[PDB]
Swiss-Prot record, chain B:
Region (Disordered): 156-197
InterPro entries (alphabetical): Ribosomal_eL18, Ribosomal_uL15/eL18, Ribosomal_uL15/eL18_sf
Compartments reported by the entry: Cytoplasm
Keywords for the protein's UniProt record, in alphabetical order: Cytoplasm, Ribonucleoprotein, Ribosomal protein
Residue spans of biased composition, Basic residues class: 178-197
Domain of life from the UniProt record: Eukaryota
Protein name: Large ribosomal subunit protein eL18
Gene Ontology biological process terms from the UniProt entry: translation
Family indicated by similarity: Belongs to the eukaryotic ribosomal protein eL18 family.
GO molecular function: RNA binding; structural constituent of ribosome
Organism (species): Leishmania major
Gene Ontology CC annotations of this record: cytoplasm; cytosolic large ribosomal subunit; nucleolus
Length: 49, 197, 66
RNA sequence: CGUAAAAGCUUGCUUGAUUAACGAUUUCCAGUACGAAUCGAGACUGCGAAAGCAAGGCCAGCGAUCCUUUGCG
RNA sequence: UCGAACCACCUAGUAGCUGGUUCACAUCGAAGUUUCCCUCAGGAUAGCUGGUGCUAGUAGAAGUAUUGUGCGGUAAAGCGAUACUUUAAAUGUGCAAACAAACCGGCCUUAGCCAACUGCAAGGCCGGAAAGAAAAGAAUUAGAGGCACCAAGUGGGCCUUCUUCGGUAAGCGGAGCAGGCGAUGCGGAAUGAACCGCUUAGGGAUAUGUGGCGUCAAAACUUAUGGGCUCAUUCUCGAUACGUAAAGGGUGUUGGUGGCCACCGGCCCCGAAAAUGGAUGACGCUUAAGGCCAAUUAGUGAAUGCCCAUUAUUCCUUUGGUAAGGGCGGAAACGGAGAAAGUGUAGCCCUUCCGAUGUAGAUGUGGCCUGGAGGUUAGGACGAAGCUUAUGGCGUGAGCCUAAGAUGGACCGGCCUCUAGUGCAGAUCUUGGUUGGCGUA
RNA sequence: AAGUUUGAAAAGCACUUUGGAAAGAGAGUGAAAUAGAACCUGAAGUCGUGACAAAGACAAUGGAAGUACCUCCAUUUCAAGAGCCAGAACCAGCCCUACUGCAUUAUCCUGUCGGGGGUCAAAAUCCGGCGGGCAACGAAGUGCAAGAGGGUCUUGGUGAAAUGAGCGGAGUAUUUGAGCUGGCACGGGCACGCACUCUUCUCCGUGAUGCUCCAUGUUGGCGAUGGAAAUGGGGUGCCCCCACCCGUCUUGAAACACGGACCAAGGAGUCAAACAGACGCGCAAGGGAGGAGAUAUGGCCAGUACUUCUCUCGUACUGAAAGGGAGAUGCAAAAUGCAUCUGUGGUGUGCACACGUCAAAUCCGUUUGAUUUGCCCAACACC
């Protein structure tokens, strides 16, 4: 819960928070999910042939 | 609650303060508590621990025993070093069985009058702990010694004398009284002298 | 009038624990052993004590030399 | 319980059912004694060609102080 | 006064038997079992408990696993009789798993074994090696080992779980293993020594356990946007375990198997007969407030509906430790004061961590109180002791101190040592005085 | 049984008035008559009277938490004052509710063909062929999840050293992820393991010549010296909840088990002697008397000061007794051997000290542990 204690124990937590906010951004999520589904189905279709 | 079954059996019984009424003993305890707390030496800690014990647990030592152990230490010493100071937290008594001794420096709580005379006439020196703290404040170049406890009549009386393997003396004022059935084969039986383990 | 039971006895015996046996190297007396071997071992031990005294004298002399 | 060229049966010779420097141990158990038993060292012997086996009949069959009485030096 | 008078004395005769035994807090805390006894309402003895320590503080540890290696004849199985036994578990039980140990090569000694020793046995000395115990699921520890001394209480037990022997059976007698009560409350089962939950310094907050959520009575102000089943007329449908009714019937109603039938279920109804009026705890409840199952605000789309402990988490204060750290040569100047080398206090001063219930019993306490002695320091006719109290203050407490007397009239308080005829609620206790019954018989 | 203990002194109550008297009401003595004759003090228990509080039957008593009324009690505040009682704000901490992505979907979704079904006709529930695929706005109630507003009459404070991503200085970049990029691993190509464009804020700072304790905001109400206000304590009643009678023997007591009307004063582990352990004190191979004497000494003075030569316990034990009686080393083998005398009889385990090594920390010169070697004190084990 504490901001000061958490940062004192793990100096790296701010970068993790940055990554979290980036991943929760709506446009990034939409593009990532759309692109990921294409990346998977295409790869499965190619590999099964 | 917490399951702490039988945790009181791990506590140990140790003495923190002296029962003695001697003001000079109190002054010595004050000095050596200071030294043991503020110095790294193990000598000061052991000396402080021994100053708090009871009279029965500070057995007196003999001058002849001091001489013998000092000689055994000396035969393997580089002959360019000085001999250590003998240090006993207790009383030093004289021994009529040994006439000739070398010259030694001995620090003790109390000396017999004849023992002090013998040490000085041999060329040695008697010392108090307050002078020892000035000469050797960390206990460097010392020989710490203890007196003998076994040999006391009270120790020789401990335990039952009627069980096999025991050689303790009974509590009896008439020495000829308990010398019969139980101690001779010609009577009913004899207490066995030896038993394994 | 004459009751017998073992009900609380194991609980009593485990308060100060069942103590383990004394190690094998202590109290290792030979009394009651087969006699001829005992008699020979005694002679060997006497010779060994003589040798120990001689060795100490030699060490003392060597240290005195250097 | 155990045992088959035996631990049973017949037979020959024998007295280890003696003595055994206060050795050690098990069972009961307080880890006391008594009774019974196990592993021994020494003497004198028995049986056997020999290695060996035997100080009773495996395991129930027995008893303090004091007093009386016998043996021994 | 007689199955052995009365008076005084030996005589306070003896009692393994009955009754009593006077202040506080703190740290710890049992046993009803073994052996022997003219020994069964008693002792001694070991065990369990307290105190004191000694010793080189992680050692020679373990009511527990793993791996390796031994032991076993009960359950089950089988066929004497018409249960004895080849086989054989689960749960057990002994030993070992690198620091006084074991492994590899020098050598010394023995009036040990062997035909002999360059072999074997034993005790030592000199050297080497050492993942200090790998990898293969390849231990763990609120894991400091050992050794003494002195002494108490107890030696009537009882209940339960799983095994059981006697007995027709018993809230009956006798045993094995473990847990309890006794010695213990608290929260639940309406109530109950022993069941369920939880085990206890003085107090807040949050959350839970067992048990609950129609009223009594905190919680679904009688929740759901869940499914089935059930109607019971003078003890009566039913409804919190431990805990106080059977065969057989029923077209009452709801379903299942095989062939409109035969059988098997679920609830309900007969079967079901006692002594004061009375008990799902009471009232009552039937689109349940019953019985089985299942949810958490409901086919919306995402972990916890709600209520109640001396438990859990956390915060404040006390007390004690086998406790753990730090400061204590007055820095200088001149917001306040203080600052002791210390077992114990109004604790020398700060900081930190963990424990706290208890009968019989042990021990500690600069712990409380009473009469007298040696010292020291004070008080009193401007009023000592004693006595009275909606006189407050201090102390966890035993108690201490002040105030007022519209009480009294001459002795006495604190502190350190010493000493004892030294503390009362109860003994059909002793002595004195009161008292209800009672203005009664 | 029973203190005659009134008072300094009998000054022991003249006189008036009511009454048969005892006595009462006045008056007087005395410092005091609530010191008036069995007369100092004058407790408890029990009883009378006056005032007050209430109160059903719930026996009474008792616990906890409030309130009404009282209070010969204590303490604190009254004007620029923080004393008492309120409200709001901010800071630290703690506790609640906010804000959330990745994997997996196939026994599924969708279009045709054939069957089968049923209707007044045709659709669907259902089955088998092959064409595609994401049920994707709240699609799963599948597994794992990381994302400042409200309390603190559940805490402390108002900056008397605020350690802060939160208070300050400096710039605008840094580097976290997501897409997309170029040897080995993974499977029979790579869904993107191992090595070398969107998305966010970054760096720097205050030691204690402060060992400990206490003293620091804002806005109102009340309090301007009183029969004051306020806080705490004490008393009595009431309400809701809780709550079996003490001591004792007993496995088990609230017991239909024994003792128990009230109060005062009295009432039970003591003194002596023998032994032992633990703790305090003196001396120590020695310790200590006792009885008695001597002279300071001839209420102080039954005390204190001094003392021999004896006695007792111990320094040695063992045997029924006649009796005998304990060092070490080297040579040697004598049924009383010989020689030296600064010395643990030996072995294993074993404080401190000395000599070196190793590991950890350190204004970093030294600590804290482990360990080799020497001597090993006490002690234990085997000889
Ligand atoms: Mg023989
Ligand atoms: Mg006779
Ligand atoms: Mg008559
Ligand atoms: Mg008497
Ligand atoms: Mg009598
Ligand atoms: Mg009694
Ligand atoms: Mg306890
Ligand atoms: Mg009785
Ligand atoms: Mg009892
Ligand atoms: Mg309980
Ligand atoms: Mg309610
Ligand atoms: Mg404390
Ligand atoms: Mg307690
Ligand atoms: Mg008395
Ligand atoms: Mg009384
Ligand atoms: Mg009077
Ligand atoms: Mg009772
Ligand atoms: Mg002696
Ligand atoms: Na001795
Ligand atoms: Na009920
Ligand atoms: Na007295």
């Amino acid at each position: 819960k504490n901001r000061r204690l958490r940062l004192r124990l793990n100096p790296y937590v701010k970068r993790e928070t940055a990554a979290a906010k980036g991943m929760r951004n709506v446009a990034n999520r939409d593009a990532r999910r759309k692109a990921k589904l294409a990346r998977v189905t295409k790869a499965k279709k190619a590999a099964t042939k | 609650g917490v399951d702490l079954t039988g945790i009181s059996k791990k506590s140990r019984v140790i003495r923190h303060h002296t029962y003695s009424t001697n003001p000079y003993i109190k002054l010595l305890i004050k000095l050596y508590k200071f030294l043991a707390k503020r110095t790294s030496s193990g000598f000061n800690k052991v000396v402080y621990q021994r100053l708090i014990k009871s009279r029965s647990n500070r057995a007196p030592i003999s001058l002849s025993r001091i001489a013998v152990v000092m000689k055994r230490k000396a035969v393997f010493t580089a002959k360019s070093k000085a001999a250590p100071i003998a240090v006993v937290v207790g009383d030093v008594l004289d021994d009529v069985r040994m006439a000739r001794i070398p010259a030694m420096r001995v620090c003790a709580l109390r000396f017999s009058k004849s023992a002090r005379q013998s040490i000085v006439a041999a060329g040695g020196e008697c010392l108090t702990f307050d002078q020892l703290a000035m000469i050797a404040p960390t206990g460097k170049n010392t020989y710490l010694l203890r007196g003998r406890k076994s040999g006391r009549e009270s120790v020789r009386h401990f335990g039952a004398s009627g069980v096999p393997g025991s050689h303790s003396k009974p509590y009896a004022t008439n020495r000829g009284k308990e010398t019969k059935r139980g101690r001779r084969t010609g009577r009913s039986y004899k207490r066995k002298a030896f038993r394994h383990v | 009038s004459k009751n017998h039971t073992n009900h609380n006895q194991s609980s009593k015996n485990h308060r100060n624990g069942i103590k383990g046996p004394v190690p094998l190297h202590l109290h290792n007396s030979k009394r009651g052993s087969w006699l001829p071997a005992l008699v020979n071992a005694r002679r060997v031990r006497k010779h060994n004590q003589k040798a120990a005294l001689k060795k100490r004298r030699e060490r003392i002399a060597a240290f005195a030399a250097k």
